[PDB]
Write an enzyme that holds these catalytic residues in place. Structure first.
Site, PDB file in Angstrom:
ATOM      1  CD  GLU A  19      37.386  -4.931  64.887  1.00 19.59           C
ATOM      2  OE1 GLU A  19      38.585  -4.605  64.727  1.00 19.59           O
ATOM      3  OE2 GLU A  19      36.979  -6.086  64.641  1.00 19.59           O
TER       4      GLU A  19
ATOM      5  CG  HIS B 198      42.032 -11.665  64.465  1.00 15.93           C
ATOM      6  ND1 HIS B 198      41.421 -10.455  64.708  1.00 15.93           N
ATOM      7  CD2 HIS B 198      43.338 -11.490  64.761  1.00 15.93           C
ATOM      8  CE1 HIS B 198      42.321  -9.585  65.128  1.00 15.93           C
ATOM      9  NE2 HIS B 198      43.493 -10.188  65.171  1.00 15.93           N
TER      10      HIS B 198
ATOM     11  CE1 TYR C 118      39.171 -16.081  69.102  1.00 10.33           C
ATOM     12  CE2 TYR C 118      39.333 -14.855  67.037  1.00 10.33           C
ATOM     13  CZ  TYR C 118      39.362 -14.886  68.414  1.00 10.33           C
ATOM     14  OH  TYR C 118      39.608 -13.731  69.114  1.00 10.33           O
TER      15      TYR C 118
ATOM     16  CD  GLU D  85      39.030  -7.435  66.425  1.00 15.00           C
ATOM     17  OE1 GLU D  85      39.568  -6.687  65.576  1.00 15.00           O
ATOM     18  OE2 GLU D  85      38.033  -8.117  66.151  1.00 15.00           O
TER      19      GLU D  85
ATOM     20  CG  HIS E  80      41.336  -3.482  64.268  1.00 19.30           C
ATOM     21  ND1 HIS E  80      41.021  -4.799  64.006  1.00 19.30           N
ATOM     22  CD2 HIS E  80      42.565  -3.278  63.729  1.00 19.30           C
ATOM     23  CE1 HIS E  80      42.014  -5.364  63.342  1.00 19.30           C
ATOM     24  NE2 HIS E  80      42.962  -4.461  63.160  1.00 19.30           N
TER      25      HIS E  80
END
EC number: 1.17.4.1
Lengths: 329, 318
Positions: free
Chosen positions: B198, B138, B142, B232, B235
């Site tokens: 998250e 991740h 970004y 996420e 998660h």
């Protein structure tokens, strides 16, 4: 029966003890060393706080401009190798386990699996330390990919041995192996003890991925030659590949260290490993059991360590050579 | 110019401060079990086990596999039509809100140090390992993104400078030292605070980017932004699942209070720093979504819906 096993351990009882002794006075030789260097190791461990690899470069959040290409490159090379336990075809295997492998072979291998499925550091002493994103990436994946290894060895154990009745004896007669204890002490020595410089733990860690199990990897590549356990051989290939990618990385990181350990230590850590590793097979599992030559095995482990030493900057201490061509890869 | 920005923050200056104040006296209200912790199964090694298969914790495992099977890399992200839409389709207001929302992602130890380290079940360690590994991809993503759309580091620099003056970062910070970084902070409470990181602390940006999907743009972004969110979520759900195995769960009041303080910092992210208006969104609905999201999490934890609001977005129906 245990008879042959006895003959086999016997042929290598002399060499075993030569080692079994050659380790013992290492728990002391160590206390001795540290004792008289209390002051020196303080300076190093104190300068440790100044190794770039160990300090956050808060002038960075972009989280890309690739500063450590060599490392990154290692991450990508390993991110690109992802694989799961469910890609392992374990069909012809079950067959060869009963109609091709003899009693001796069904033993060696069973034990060698039980070993793999037994052996915190990576994460808690390394992935935590090292303040460069490039490396954290590598380690994260390393921890993740090692968990798939763990699943694999158990799947395997669980596929070949279907009578937990045995699976139990198996694991009971596996925690009486003096090597586990010895390996243990080898670790409390260079790793678990505080005031243990980072660079030294790197040599001890690379020794865990590159030396402490080179003996089983090859033993299983031997089964490839006589075309058997196709599934095992395949997993055993991907794994080895991996643990190598991992060992190489330690070396690479050692290189970035400014204050590297005394070549003597680098050589001594590796060396003590090799000896516990050789002793694995001249005491517990004789490579003879599956048609191998103990002399050549001992020689390979030495080759492997030798190879690592050069990777670290030291010089070949053994000066032996690759007694196996199937490990040429 | 900053003019509109001002008008926009202004429309939500009142609501902002209502919150900006409603947090402050929380550093105090706070100042104003851990021994039994040593007895939660999830926290103690079952040395009667090395087999490292017999699947004791199927529920967990299942979570690992469901996530091991979702592996993906940053190099599967096609970022071509993106660069185009960034200049010839997105207006000035849009290039802004998104830029900043990326800079945010690329900024925000816990997963591992506090958790992966605790939790003595292999089934879970596997999940966490993969969680840490997948979160690193991740992070790469970004930055790749930031690095693709913004090619003049001269800007990229201003960008990151005018991003560490956002009172939310500080506030988020204090929110954390409160339930997580402080010792004598029960495991179950840190789980609620982690799931909130998250599942709530970034639900606002995910949706804001799903909004760009609607008006068909930033196809590459939308795609990455989809896989990430998916993740996420996987998660967050996991935290809940693990909360469930806890025998001594926290006081429902805390569970509700941790989440709640999060939501407020999250809403305040957009009624102060980035106005969703900037890309055609309705601040009232955004605020309402974050509330929905938290609400949803509370039920997952066992508590009751404190907001009772509903999903103001259909594109987030998933």
């Amino acid at each position: 029966l245990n008879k042959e096993l006895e003959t086999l351990r016997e042929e290598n009882r002399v060499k075993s003890d030569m080692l079994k002794e050659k380790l013992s006075k290492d728990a002391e030789n160590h206390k001795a060393y540290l004792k008289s260097h209390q002051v020196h190791r303080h300076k190093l461990k104190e300068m440790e706080k100044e190794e770039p690899l160990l300090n956050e470069d808060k002038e960075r959040t972009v989280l890309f401009p690739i500063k450590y290409h060599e490392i990154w490159q290692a991450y990508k090379r390993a991110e690109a190798s992802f694989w799961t336990a469910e890609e392992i075809d374990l069909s012809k295997d079950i067959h060869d386990w009963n109609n091709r492998m003899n009693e001796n072979e069904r033993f060696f291998i069973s034990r060698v699996l039980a070993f793999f499925a037994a052996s915190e550091n990576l994460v808690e002493n390394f992935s935590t330390e090292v303040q460069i994103p490039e490396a954290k990436s590598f380690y994260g994946f390393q921890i993740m990919i090692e968990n798939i290894h763990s699943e694999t060895y158990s799947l395997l154990i669980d596929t070949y041995i279907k009578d937990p009745k045995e699976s139990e004896f198996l694991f009971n007669a596996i925690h009486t192996i003096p090597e586990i204890g010895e390996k243990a002490e080898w670790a409390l020595r260079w790793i678990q003890d505080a005031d243990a410089l980072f660079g030294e733990r790197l040599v001890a860690f690379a020794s865990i991925e590159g030396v402490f199990f080179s003996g089983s990897f090859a033993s299983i590549f031997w089964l490839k030659k006589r075309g058997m356990m196709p599934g095992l051989t395949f997993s055993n290939e991907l794994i080895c590949r991996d643990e190598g990618l991992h060992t190489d990385f330690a070396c690479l990181l050692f290189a970035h260290l400014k204050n590297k350990p005394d070549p003597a230590i680098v050589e001594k850590i590796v060396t003590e490993a090799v000896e516990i590793e050789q002793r694995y097979f001249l005491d517990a599992l004789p490579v003879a059991l599956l048609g191998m030559n103990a002399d050549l095995m001992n020689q390979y482990v030495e080759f492997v360590a030798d190879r690592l030493l050069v990777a670290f900057g030291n010089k070949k201490y053994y000066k032996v050579e690759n007694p196996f061509d199937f490990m040429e890869n």
